[PDB]
Design a protein around this ligand. Structure first.
Ligand SMILES: *[C@@H]1O[C@H](CO)[C@@H](O[C@@H]2O[C@H](CO)[C@@H](O[C@@H]3O[C@H](CO[C@@H]4O[C@H](CO)[C@@H](O)[C@H](O)[C@@H]4O)[C@@H](O)[C@H](O[C@H]4O[C@H](CO)[C@@H](O)[C@H](O)[C@@H]4O)[C@@H]3O)[C@H](O)[C@H]2NC(C)=O)[C@H](O)[C@H]1NC(C)=O
Ligand SMILES: *C/C=C(C)/C=C/C=C(C)/C=C/C1=C(C)CCCC1(C)C
Ligand SMILES: CCCCCCCCO[C@@H]1O[C@H](CO)[C@@H](O)[C@H](O)[C@H]1O
Ligand SMILES: CCCCCCCCO[C@@H]1O[C@H](CO)[C@@H](O)[C@H](O)[C@H]1O
Ligand SMILES: *C(=O)CCCCCCCCCCCCCCC
Ligand SMILES: *C(=O)CCCCCCCCCCCCCCC
Length: 326
């Protein structure tokens, strides 16, 4: 018997020596050394110092440069807003709790932090799904006499917030729950404890199918097609060096986007899967931190990939940072 249970928590450490405490009430220095808690705090400090400016710039530069305010770009603004929910709801809270060594804000703060952080990563997740749908439509043109505009972009944004509420809301009201994870300083969905009163088993199956498998299939299909169309069109135009280079660029970027999506979400999905099919196994606190490390760090690498590497935004940002010149 692997940990210690409580009304709203599961500490991943045995209480045979009697030292375990509520992660809402006292430090967890028997799970991990104080310096490891400090390193958690350092890592959140890094993600704030990099994630805040990068995502805030994205919004600010868009306010200063008319060329960026196209409808295809609305979902990338949405991505930056989501990243900021993670920065201000998640990372700042965890910086604070890590340096106490436990979730000092108690079970209500655990629901708050877990909600805003989960909502953030989920809006981001679906933003990358919708962007792939939007680009597939625009390029592969699978419905004739259709022109992607403002209206559709608004719907895409609204859809991400609905899908994210469908993940983040139910654990506030009975289906799964928010409890402290890993080192017990951040809160997330209880995806690893069988907890029949809240129906954790069904919620994890729903999450895995609807919020991981569906996303992954939609992304592979949409970008799979997009690459096919672009490569077919370029083979029909080998006289153009331009078209050939654009085809190489599009293909490389699609590979990077798809790999980035897997890096971000496969660890949560794989760990959840392994735990679901190996219910007689202990999982320690550092191990349970790894999925979060991969997901949370996307609040930096997603805007680098989707925004910073796009040359329109990059010019405007330099201009904005250099007070109006270049
Ligand atoms: C992990 O495992 C530990 C050990 O089992 C648990 O910690 C114990 O929790 C219990 C309560 O569930 C604690 O018992 C209470 O002690 C209170 C404090 O006073 C004690 O004073 C004596 C000196 O007289 C000291 O030697 C003790 O160490 C205590 O400090 C006391 O207020 C209280 O008594 C009241 O309730 C009991 C009923 O439970 C009645 O007997 C009594 O009439 C009165 O109403 C308890 O006796 C115990 O002290 C804790 N032990 C330690 C080592 O911390 C953790 O809770 C477990 N963790 C999790 C997360 O579940
Ligand atoms: C800081 C922690 C965050 C932002 C964690 C968010 C976690 C998710 C949205 C994870 C969802 C998943 C499961 C709970 C299991 C099935 C696979 C996922 C990725 C959909
Ligand atoms: C940038 C934000 C800084 C966060 C300030 C963290 C304050 C930590 O608070 C400390 O927590 C200990 C628990 O291990 C307590 O014993 C002490 O009372 C307290 O000094
Ligand atoms: C779901 C997204 C999958 C993208 C499929 C990538 C197709 C790999 O195809 C490769 O693309 C390279 C870049 O032009 C070429 O240099 C290789 O010769 C070509 O086979
Ligand atoms: C508009 O063009 C404004 C550009 C900024 C001009 C000032 C340049 C100062 C560069 C020094 C950066 C060091 C900051 C580190 C502080 C710890
Ligand atoms: C255009 O003319 C303006 C360019 C000036 C930018 C100066 C470069 C600043 C780099 C700062 C990194 C410091 C990290 C620590 C922050 C507290």
């Amino acid at each position: 018997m692997c940990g210690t249970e409580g009304p709203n928590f599961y500490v991943p450490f045995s209480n045979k020596t009697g030292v375990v405490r509520s992660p809402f009430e006292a430090p967890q220095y028997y799970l991990a050394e104080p310096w490891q808690f400090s390193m958690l705090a350092a890592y959140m400090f890094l993600l704030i110092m990099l994630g805040f400016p990068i995502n805030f710039l994205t919004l600010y530069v868009t306010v200063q440069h008319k060329k960026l305010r196209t409808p295809l770009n609305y979902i990338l603004l949405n991505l930056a807003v989501a990243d900021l929910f993670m920065v201000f709801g998640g990372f700042t809270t965890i910086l604070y709790t890590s340096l106490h060594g436990y979730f000092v804000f108690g079970p209500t703060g655990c629901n708050l932090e877990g909600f805003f952080a989960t909502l953030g990563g989920e809006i981001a997740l679906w933003s990358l799904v919708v962007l792939a749908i939007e680009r597939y439509v625009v390029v592969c043109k699978p419905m004739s006499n259709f022109r992607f505009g403002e209206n559709h972009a608004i719907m895409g944004v609204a859809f991400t917030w609905v899908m994210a509420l469908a993940c983040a809301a139910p654990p506030l009201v009975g289906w799964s729950r928010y409890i402290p994870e890993g080192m017990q300083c951040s809160c997330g969905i209880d995806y690893y404890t069988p907890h029949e009163e809240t129906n954790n088993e069904s919620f994890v199956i729903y999450m895995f199918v609807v919020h991981f498998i569906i996303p992954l299939i939609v992304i592979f299909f949409c970008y799979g097609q997009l690459v096919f169309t672009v490569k077919e069109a370029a083979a029909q135009q080998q006289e153009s060096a331009t078209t050939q280079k654009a085809e190489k660029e599009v293909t490389r970027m699609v590979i990077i986007m798809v790999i980035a999506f897997l890096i971000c979400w496969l660890p949560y999905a794989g760990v959840a899967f392994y735990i679901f099919t190996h219910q007689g196994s202990c999982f320690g606190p550092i191990f349970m931190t790894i999925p979060a490390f991969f997901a949370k760090t996307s609040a930096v690498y997603n805007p680098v990939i989707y925004i910073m590497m796009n040359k329109q935004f990059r010019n405007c940002m330099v201009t904005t940072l250099c007070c109006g010149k270049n």
